[PDB]
Design a protein around this nucleic acid. Structure first.
Ligand code: MG
Ligand code: MG
Ligand code: MG
Ligand code: MG
Ligand code: MG
Ligand code: MG
Ligand code: MG
Ligand code: MG
Ligand code: MG
Ligand code: MG
Ligand code: MG
Ligand code: MG
Ligand code: MG
Ligand code: MG
Lengths: 72, 174, 104, 134, 176
RNA sequence: GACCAUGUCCUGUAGAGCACUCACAAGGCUAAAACCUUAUGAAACUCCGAAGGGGCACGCGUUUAGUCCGGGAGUGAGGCUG
RNA sequence: CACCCCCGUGCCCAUAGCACUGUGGAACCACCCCACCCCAUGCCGAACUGGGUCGUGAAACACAGCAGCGCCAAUGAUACUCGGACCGCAGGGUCCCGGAAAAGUCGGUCAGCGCGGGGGUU
């Protein structure tokens, strides 16, 4: 063994209560650990970036049912 | 008897078997107990009976011990739970099992194991619950198991466990 | 099962586009076909077939569409999204769309 | 005691026991006083001796079990390369966790059984009789 | 055609009289008749398997479909995605004809103590049928079709009761 | 700036649990997998799950640092304790 | 939101779901009804689908009862831990302050809020 692979510094890049420019990246994820609410659009590797400038808010009933909206 | 100790008061090195709540729909109550004097009663009553307490204020309150929270590191009690008795078949209590006499497998066979040392049942009588359950094991042969289904249940008691569950069972030696 | 309707109604993510959606119920030919702004829990333009008659269901459906088109144009609406139900765009409902946008 | 198939290696730590602080099954029993690993072989010696005291008996549950491999490095080698391969299995035994639990044998007989069964053990222990059990 | 519908209409009052329903629709009906060839007992080349689909099609006036092997590599010559037995649903006029082919003159009657011994047990529809062999036709000539595969034929009927299964054969021209 | 307080969001550790995976303890049941009562461990198990911790905003409060831009560096062998 | 009830479509996002079950009927919905064609089945008008009344509330669906199940779930007590301060050679553990679960008991629920329309008391 003695093998390993680079860190992928994934996360909630922008936490609810953070104003965001358009195109800011807010969550990094392997998949849909977050499912993108209103105003946000999710990319190829399933990072989801805000489309509209404003505050970031978490809709989060959880269990795969967590969504990131942006409010203007 | 017990005194009030609401919130988190300190205890005496006389254990005062604290951390005791009695509850139903009505009211929650305070902790403080009288240490060994608790144990001296509990072993006699041992979940299958009730006894009144008299904190200052409420001169009487019947409860039947729901559960105990003993220390792990030094086998001693700590917290005890209680449930009030609303009477009129409301009681869901775990009766101890007991076994009578020589069995036919205790004659020439070997072991006589109680697979369920205690078993839960509802009691039609609230203030009258069996203190034990002597079982007539005399007539079983070696390799037979008395199932719960034929366990005597005095005075209209229901059985809160599977009819087909084994309770006692004679076992071969070795 | 009828995973046609939850699928087609999750595909109206473009209610985020601002257009209203136009539900249809090719059931008993009741084809009531409401128009809804989802943001409020509000519907804005009913067209139930209570006594419209008009004959066979495929043409009574187009009658329901042509009547609702007026019923919604009164209030000032023009953006449209045809949230089909489980049903296909097979004709008896397709007439509803043809007659509806014939006279928006 | 040996575990029939696994994943290969482990690690270690301790804090007080959360599984098996109360006795069931048996009549009397025995409890740890000290946190520790216990090898398969320490179990098997307790079984051998308490089966010596329990001829034609059959009242010997073993409510513990070597789950954890532990792997010494080979002969004389400087450090470098893996944890060799496993040398023996051990069971974590935190205090208050029962190990042993007899039935069917009179108090002084079980008491002597537990004397010998503890003396082969690497820990303090205590015999207990069951009554404060829900 | 008309005779199968007449036997349906004679069964439905027969069941309302042996067991009253509030509704004729509550009465048992026969939904579909399925026939499942299973040439995985004799997996072949395209020749023999298309020939068996050919014979079922000639018997049916339907195009049989091939059931295809599930992902299940196995000891028994099992593979990934290959044919493993024909299937044929029948509903409507194509179904009842076959039952009227079987209840009446078109029954081969090649072997019959009674009807096949009862198997639904639970009494809701599913009445499975086994034909051990197909030496049961004038559609074949035995020397050329010297091979003789069997057939499975499941009857599907509504029935919320166990005893009600008796209705779907006794009054339906089948021995019991 | 910095600490500290409020608000908010994100986390899968300690613990704890077997609901899935591996393991495993006494029996009942039975063509034994399965199943039930009882009983347990888990770095690559999680029905759960703190304390804390990080980002934002405020300062609703005490403080004095910070940021960038230009000249010069050295350092890139660490040691202990908890 | 005059009172109920039906068809639909939302918010919610198992305290709303399961099962047992009873009411429902041409008002609504639902099966049954026929198929050369619109249209379709990798075979079947089963599914889409197109042409309709009877018939029937059977099934499905709606709505009530329902605490067997699931779902939630205290208080209390612990586990643990931020800071402080200690003991044991060691594994390990204690104390002061404050935050504090998980499991279980007690107990809670077979929901709760809209919007448009259809038919009722005529
Ligand atoms: Mg650790
Ligand atoms: Mg436990
Ligand atoms: Mg290595
Ligand atoms: Mg600042
Ligand atoms: Mg742990
Ligand atoms: Mg960290
Ligand atoms: Mg400001
Ligand atoms: Mg410089
Ligand atoms: Mg270096
Ligand atoms: Mg270093
Ligand atoms: Mg508490
Ligand atoms: Mg503090
Ligand atoms: Mg600390
Ligand atoms: Mg504390």
């Amino acid at each position: 063994n003695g093998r390993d692979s680079n860190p992928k510094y994934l996360g909630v890049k922008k936490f609810g209560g953070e104003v965001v420019k358009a195109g800011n990246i807010l969550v990094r994820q392997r998949g849909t650990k977050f499912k993108a609410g209103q105003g946000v659009g999710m990319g190829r590797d399933h990072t989801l970036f805000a489309l509209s400038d404003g505050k970031v808010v978490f809709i989060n009933k959880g269990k795969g049912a967590r969504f990131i909206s942006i409010e203007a | 008897e017990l005194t009030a100790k609401p919130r988190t008061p300190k205890q005496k090195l006389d254990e005062s078997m604290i951390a005791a709540v009695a509850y139903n729909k009505e009211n929650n109550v305070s902790f403080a107990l009288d240490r060994k004097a608790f144990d001296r009663a509990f072993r006699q009553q041992s979940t299958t009976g009730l006894f009144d307490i008299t904190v200052e204020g409420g001169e009487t309150f019947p409860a039947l011990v729901k559960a105990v929270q003993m220390d792990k590191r030094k086998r001693a009690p700590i917290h005890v739970d209680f449930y009030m008795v609303t009477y009129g078949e409301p009681v869901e209590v775990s009766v101890p099992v007991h076994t009578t006499g020589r069995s036919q497998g205790e004659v020439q066979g070997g072991l006589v194991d109680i697979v369920v040392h205690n078993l839960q049942i509802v009691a039609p009588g609230p203030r009258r619950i069996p203190q034990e359950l002597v079982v007539d094991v005399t007539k079983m042969n070696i390799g037979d198991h008395i199932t719960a289904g034929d366990i005597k249940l005095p005075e209209g008691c229901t059985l809160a466990a599977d009819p087909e569950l084994t309770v006692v069972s004679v076992l071969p030696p070795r | 099962r009828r995973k046609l309707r939850t699928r087609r109604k999750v595909r109206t993510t473009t209610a985020a586009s601002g257009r209203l959606r136009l539900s249809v119920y090719r059931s008993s030919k009741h084809i009531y076909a409401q128009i809804i702004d989802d943001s409020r829990g509000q519907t804005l333009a009913a067209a139930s077939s209570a006594a419209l008659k008009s004959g066979n269901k495929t043409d009574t459906a187009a009658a329901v569409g042509k009547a609702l088109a007026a019923a919604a144009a009164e209030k000032g609406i023009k953006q449209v999204v045809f949230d089909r139900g489980s049903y296909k765009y097979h004709g008896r409902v397709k007439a509803l769309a043809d007659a509806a946008r014939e006279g928006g | 005691k040996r575990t029939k198939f696994r994943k290969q290696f482990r690690g270690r730590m301790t804090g007080d026991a959360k599984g098996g602080d109360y006795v069931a099954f048996g009549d009397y029993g025995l409890i740890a006083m000290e946190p520790a690993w216990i090898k398969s072989n320490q179990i098997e010696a307790c079984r051998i001796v308490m089966s010596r005291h329990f001829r034609r008996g059959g009242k010997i549950y073993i409510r513990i079990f070597p789950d954890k491999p532990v792997t010494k490095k080979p002969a004389e080698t400087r450090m470098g390369k893996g944890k060799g391969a496993v040398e023996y299995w051990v069971s974590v035994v935190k205090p208050g966790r029962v190990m042993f639990e007899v039935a069917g044998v009179t108090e002084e007989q079980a008491k002597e059984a537990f004397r010998l069964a503890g003396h082969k053990l690497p820990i303090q222990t205590k015999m207990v009789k069951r009554e404060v059990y829900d | 055609q008309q005779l199968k519908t007449k036997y349906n209409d004679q069964v439905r009052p027969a069941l309302m009289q042996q067991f009253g329903y509030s509704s004729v629709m509550a009465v048992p009906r026969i939904e579909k008749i399925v026939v499942n060839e299973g040439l995985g007992s004799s997996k072949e080349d395209s020749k023999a398997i298309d020939k068996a689909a050919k014979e079922l099609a000639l018997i049916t006036l339907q195009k049989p479909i091939i059931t295809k092997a599930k992902k299940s590599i196995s000891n028994f010559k099992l593979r990934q995605g290959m044919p493993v037995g024909i299937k044929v649903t029948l509903r409507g006029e194509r179904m009842y004809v076959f039952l009227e082919k079987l209840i009446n003159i078109g029954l081969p009657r090649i072997r019959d103590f009674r009807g096949i011994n009862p198997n639904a047990f639970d009494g809701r529809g599913n009445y499975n049928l086994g034909i051990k062999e197909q030496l049961i036709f004038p559609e074949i000539t035995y020397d050329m079709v010297d091979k003789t595969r069997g057939m499975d034929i499941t009857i599907v009927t509504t029935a919320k009761t166990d005893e009600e299964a008796r209705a779907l054969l006794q009054s339906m021209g089948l021995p019991f």
